[PDB]
Structure 1
């Protein structure tokens, strides 16, 4: 399994390293045949190649079978022209591999219900997966613009854009609890009706999966009032953005949230958290997101479901035994990772 490791900036490096200590342990123990290489990306890349996604890195991604990314961004590279800012490096990553679906899990691990803003009974059992469409939507729709008197943007979606993202959703519900909820606004917008219809059409190919539709505004409050009944949620670009962030507040911390951007090319797995530059190098960063992103990589990129689960349970044990500083504990990056490993052997 050839992995391209793009640590990035800030705490990216130390958390990505934490994940790597887990991968190697797993590798040594069962001979998975792991081969990974670290490439410059984001600010680290700018500081040497003048661009956030240099050619060596670009190739490293194409060659690998999966990408384990860390974090990007930092005040240093915030004065630079947009075309070379760390953030743009990520867009270039996505567009090169044509990643169109952004998987954003939200799971409340047993024992951690106390972290959620919801009462324990409601949080208990949450394990939703928001699948957002990245490439199209009002974020990219033409025409658009503004003058002194008015502004306008266009929410546009084509049949093929909606189909390929719907496929990823049905595909994942199958690995999960066979349930999919398509979120749209078919009661007012044409795009809503076109989205709903297209999802229903793709849905026929997965008779084993229960499909349901919901209006974005209705889904918003549903995710907060009873998120335990949802498995896979699939929606458009802008709606998925709102709903993903909404789902992320459920577990009770961003350090616990991993993610994956799937598409045509190399899968990209990376923690949701930012680069947190002022705590970088201090050794207190919570490696959970990165470790969990490694688990998603094992399962989804390498089909090692059983192995991905082990990592997931070890991490859960660790969170309870030695919670990191952001969970109210004292376990820095190293000590926390040690506890995880102490559950993988």
Structure 2
């Protein structure tokens, strides 16, 4: 209604499980609040340059701006933080990309990022972390990290089912838990907030199936289920058992020695994919001490949030970490950092996260060549030490570039 759909351009189509991408697809993008005003222009420019270079003018993206966050209230009115048509348009055009979003406080509004994922049922949050040679890192061997995270997006504590301490609601569930359920283990029932953590079988098997399928398609070495099941047995422990069960029932997993680890034979390359599990808190140690042991990771919503952030700091990537939210009917690629309002408009932050989520975008569309051109550009600009302030502070011998100029440095290195 306030979005202008491009005169030229065609919708991507879902022809049962498969995308049918035209040569001039329309892609919805949400600019983002804060530094989204700096990073999104940079990404629109390097994606245009890479599809221009790969396909010699034969292909072109017709970018269509849609609204969420603070910019949505300036277009549609002070109270509409998430217009209903953003959800219809992402559904409709199948793939979109977004910058960082501001969720406000004071207004009872929950995370607009979790709202998009739940509302569109984008149950996979895919976070790949690899090291780009030459980025400053706090660890001695960042090059040993190349993992791909499959974090469940629709359930867990992250779903937002919770009640305030002293509310009538919380009082009512606490009464139901103590009286009807007989729980004796709430230490202080008065002035007590209560949160609900759900974990279902369909919820964990649709995520784990995607993780093993990803490992077969890209012949990765292993899928590691990480969970805190020795303490949360019926949610996190259920997730590890349902995960193992799916690798046995649908991928023909077999015990290695006397378990619990399984072997899945990659029907394409013939190699064995170890399916294993590790408790989440020892895993937060293993990624620092033994990162080469791990590769595809499957976990619940909260743990995946912690694992992705911890990994991304290790490979010097807090500002170049890409991410995607994939459901069955559409996909939403995104800058994984926040809006950083201090720097907003100054053209200085790293455009690296949203540029690398755009290469994940291009790859999902089957435009593999344009996507390989962006990572070639990325590795060249970083290797050239022609870098943005966050990388330059930690480097010696680096040239400092603005956000838009690092965009150009990626195109020069293509």
Q: 286-295 vs 26-35, which deviates more?
A: 26-35
- Matched with 1:195 is 239
- Matched with 1:309 is 372
Q: What is the CA–CA distance in structure 2 between the aligned matches of 1:14 and 1:141, rounded to whole Å?
A: 31
Of 155, 168, 181, the match for 2:197: 155
Are 1:82 and 2:92 counterparts?
Answer: no
Are 1:91 and 2:114 counterparts?
Answer: yes
- Matched with 2:325 is 261
User: Which segments of 5 or more consecutive residues in structure 2 lack a partner in the other structure?
Assistant: 1-24, 164-169, 175-188, 252-263, 267-272, 393-398
- The Cα of 1:295 is off from its aligned counterpart by 0.4
- Counting only pairs closer than 5 Å after superposition, residues 204-283 of structure 1 correspond to structure 2 as 204=248, 205-206=250-251, 207=264, 208=266, 209-283=273-347
- Matched with 1:133 is 152
- Matched with 1:72 is 101
> Which SS does the other structure have where 1:128 is aligned?
strand
- The Cα of 1:152 is off from its aligned counterpart by 4.6
Note the alpha carbon deviations across 1:4-52, whole angstroms, 9 max, x for none: 1001211112211111112212333312342220112210001231312
| TM-score w.r.t. length of structure 1 | 0.89
Answer yes or no: is the 8 Å Cα contact 1:141–1:156 preserved in 2: no
Are 1:327 and 2:379 counterparts?
Answer: no
Q: 170-179 vs 313-322, which deviates more?
A: 170-179
* RMSD after superposition: 2.2
Q: What is the CA–CA distance in structure 1 between the aligned matches of 2:217 and 2:371, rounded to whole Å?
A: 13
Answer yes or no: is the 8 Å Cα contact 1:163–1:202 preserved in 2: yes
- Matched with 2:143 is 124
Q: What is the CA–CA distance in structure 2 between the aligned matches of 1:142 and 1:15, rounded to whole Å?
A: 33
Are 1:12 and 2:36 counterparts?
Answer: yes
- Matched with 1:27 is 51
Are 1:338 and 2:408 counterparts?
Answer: yes
> Which SS does the other structure have where 2:316 is aligned?
coil
> Which SS does the other structure have where 2:322 is aligned?
coil
- The Cα of 1:305 is off from its aligned counterpart by 3.3
Answer yes or no: is the 8 Å Cα contact 2:35–2:343 preserved in 1: yes
Question: Which structure: greater helix fraction?
Answer: 1
Q: What is the CA–CA distance in structure 2 between the aligned matches of 1:235 and 1:326, rounded to whole Å?
A: 30
User: Which segments of 5 or more consecutive residues in structure 1 lack a partner in the other structure?
Assistant: none
> Which SS does the other structure have where 1:68 is aligned?
strand
Note the alpha carbon deviations across 1:152-183, whole angstroms, 9 max, x for none: 54433111011011122112223431421001
Answer yes or no: is the 8 Å Cα contact 2:87–2:120 preserved in 1: no
Q: 146-155 vs 329-338, which deviates more?
A: 146-155
Answer yes or no: is the 8 Å Cα contact 1:124–1:228 preserved in 2: no
Of 144, 151, 164, the match for 2:206: 164
Cα 1:318–1:166 shift into 2, 3 Å: same
| TM-score w.r.t. length of structure 2 | 0.75
Q: What is the CA–CA distance in structure 2 between the aligned matches of 1:278 and 1:266, rounded to whole Å?
A: 33
- Matched with 1:184 is 227
Cα 1:20–1:339 shift into 2, 3 Å: same
Q: What is the CA–CA distance in structure 2 between the aligned matches of 1:12 and 1:277, rounded to whole Å?
A: 10
Figure out how many residues of one structure are paired with residues of the other and give that number.
333
Note the alpha carbon deviations across 1:70-124, whole angstroms, 9 max, x for none: 0111xxx7455123xxx64333322221011211222111222xx22211xx312
Higher gyration radius (CA): 2
